[PDB]
Design an enzyme around this catalytic site. Sequence first.
Site, PDB file in Angstrom:
ATOM      1  CD  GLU B 174      10.720 -25.058  47.562  1.00  0.00           C
ATOM      2  OE1 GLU B 174      11.182 -24.047  48.125  1.00  0.00           O
ATOM      3  OE2 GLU B 174       9.949 -24.978  46.588  1.00  0.00           O
ATOM      4  CG  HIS B 183      12.256 -19.116  41.382  1.00  0.00           C
ATOM      5  ND1 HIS B 183      10.999 -18.603  41.609  1.00  0.00           N
ATOM      6  CD2 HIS B 183      12.336 -20.249  42.117  1.00  0.00           C
ATOM      7  CE1 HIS B 183      10.339 -19.396  42.432  1.00  0.00           C
ATOM      8  NE2 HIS B 183      11.127 -20.404  42.753  1.00  0.00           N
ATOM      9  CE1 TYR B 213       9.063 -22.112  40.632  1.00  0.00           C
ATOM     10  CE2 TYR B 213       7.182 -20.853  39.845  1.00  0.00           C
ATOM     11  CZ  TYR B 213       7.993 -21.269  40.871  1.00  0.00           C
ATOM     12  OH  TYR B 213       7.754 -20.822  42.147  1.00  0.00           O
ATOM     13  N   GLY B 331      25.879 -47.570  23.339  1.00  0.00           N
ATOM     14  CA  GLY B 331      25.014 -48.709  23.550  1.00  0.00           C
ATOM     15  C   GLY B 331      24.787 -49.415  22.248  1.00  0.00           C
ATOM     16  CB  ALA B 342      41.647 -36.131  28.195  1.00  0.00           C
ATOM     17  CG  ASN B 344      39.009 -38.869  25.194  1.00  0.00           C
ATOM     18  OD1 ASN B 344      39.285 -38.111  24.273  1.00  0.00           O
ATOM     19  ND2 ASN B 344      38.744 -38.437  26.418  1.00  0.00           N
ATOM     20  N   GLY B 357      37.936 -38.911  18.353  1.00  0.00           N
ATOM     21  CA  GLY B 357      38.721 -38.831  19.563  1.00  0.00           C
ATOM     22  C   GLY B 357      39.203 -37.455  19.946  1.00  0.00           C
ATOM     23  CG  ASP B 371      31.263 -49.023  14.325  1.00  0.00           C
ATOM     24  OD1 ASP B 371      30.164 -48.669  14.783  1.00  0.00           O
ATOM     25  OD2 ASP B 371      31.690 -50.182  14.456  1.00  0.00           O
ATOM     26  CG  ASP B 387      43.685 -40.790  17.830  1.00  0.00           C
ATOM     27  OD1 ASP B 387      44.326 -40.272  18.770  1.00  0.00           O
ATOM     28  OD2 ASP B 387      42.623 -40.304  17.396  1.00  0.00           O
TER      29      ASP B 387
END
EC number: 3.4.24.40
Lengths: 100, 468
Positions: B174, B183, B213, B331, B342, B344, B357, B371, B387
């Site tokens: 609102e 909308h 919506y 995680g 960039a 990283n 990367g 990994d 890297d």
Amino acid sequence: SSLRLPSAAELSGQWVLSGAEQHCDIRLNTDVLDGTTWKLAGDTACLQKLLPEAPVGWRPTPDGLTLTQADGSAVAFFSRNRDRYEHKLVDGSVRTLKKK
Amino acid sequence: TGYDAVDDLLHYHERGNGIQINGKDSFSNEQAGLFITRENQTWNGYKVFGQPVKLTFSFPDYKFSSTNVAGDTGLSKFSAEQQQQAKLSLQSWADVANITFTEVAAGQKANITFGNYSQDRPGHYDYGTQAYAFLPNTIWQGQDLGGQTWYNVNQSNVKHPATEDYGRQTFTHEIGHALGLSHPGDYNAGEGNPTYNDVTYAEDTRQFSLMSYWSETNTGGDNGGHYAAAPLLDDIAAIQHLYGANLSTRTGDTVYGFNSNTGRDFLSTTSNSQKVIFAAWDAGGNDTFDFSGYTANQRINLNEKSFSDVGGLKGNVSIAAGVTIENAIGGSGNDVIVGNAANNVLKGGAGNDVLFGGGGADELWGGAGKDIFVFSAASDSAPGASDWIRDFQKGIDKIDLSFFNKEANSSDFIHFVDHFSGTAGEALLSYNASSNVTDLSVNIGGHQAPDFLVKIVGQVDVATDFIV
Ligand SMILES: [Ca+2]
Ligand SMILES: [Ca+2]
Ligand SMILES: [Ca+2]
Ligand SMILES: [Ca+2]
Ligand SMILES: [Ca+2]
Ligand SMILES: [Ca+2]
Ligand SMILES: [Ca+2]
Ligand SMILES: [Zn+2]
């Protein structure tokens, strides 16, 4: 302007999931699955036939209804079209959810 | 391959460019932003775009028996909780665009106002509506209605915005209107049976804008039953168009997610159970998407205007256009983490992750688990600005060079040699026992000197540590 969010309570009850002629009777319960999800009762066998997986939860949304997995992730969302809620599969097949 | 994972994530939710989704045209971030502002009404005047603005707001003491311009009654002043949450929503708009809000006392003329209503007519409770507002400069019957926002306090979430995110989202939404937004499509609550079928473009869902919506699931998102509290990707574009981009926001080294130093409830989490949903706006510094506390498999993309699947949700995190986030921390689940051009620092954490990367000099950490480190361009890591893989585990981790082969249209393109000949696809692995560093040199373009170099902390077994 915004849409209201129905309560689990007003949408709970007896529903029928209609697929490729099959029909599954499910009970959208007010039992709590988690913070944003409630419990759903129904025959998994039947549900597996009409959906990519047998959902165990559900929740109202302002524009439809969401059937979820045990961890709350979406299995199938059904948009509200007047009197029924409908979901389309990956192949475009329609699935309908209507309160009995 | 680890490359396939990266590729999928880089083509997640493509938009604009004549794409058709859900039978609707696909609008780009920029088109959607302009469309949401189609009314051309701003606090600076009709069609006056890109100028900053300073607005006042208040929570008037409405008397229960009054009736507002919309004919609603059973009014009331905003409670303390509602006022608290309303101030958080106001701020989130101020964070992204050049808007300055200052509260005036109830009774002073304010640009934006908040009030509750509970009845459509005396003695008749309205349990059907949610809220509404008037865009700036809305003249009706000789009087200006612009800036008024009204909420149906019979709805629990409107009464308790602090514990029901839909209520908090309603406030932000609102306020969007009160600022000049519409909308993303021509529909309105209660005006017939509007459905997602009435949208102008496919991205008109809660995944892209809270002015919409429709369920985020229409485009593939999944917010687990939660609702974003602050302006989403297309919202940011819309509002920045009206009042300019706020280049003073979080110009320091900012951390989003866990261990956040944002001081924003929607950009922070303290547990795996507290999911985040946001579109990042940051104007400077060395930033980090810290998603370490989540146990779900995640997909993090640090490219502007892209979507990530964070904390078990889908398409719940995005980066606004023109924003550069530098680091990401996965995680304990199996994640896919993609950097940008960039430099990283990407860390996979526990679980079996895939790290890419991209351009610049990146520092990669696979953490525990098996990994995969992915490379696809010689310039991704050029000799002299390579890297670094900081924790390679011989016989566990893998280096993915498959792309160069696919690109060379041959599997035997990449080949390990003991001495360089100047031939293309020649790869040479040498170990530095003094530093415990393996140097991987590759001559992609068949030059005199190799054009690709990766410095790896640890040892690599050529017989088992490669994906080609
Ligand atoms: Ca920053
Ligand atoms: Ca940055
Ligand atoms: Ca991980
Ligand atoms: Ca990079
Ligand atoms: Ca790992
Ligand atoms: Ca590892
Ligand atoms: Ca690089
Ligand atoms: Zn609205």
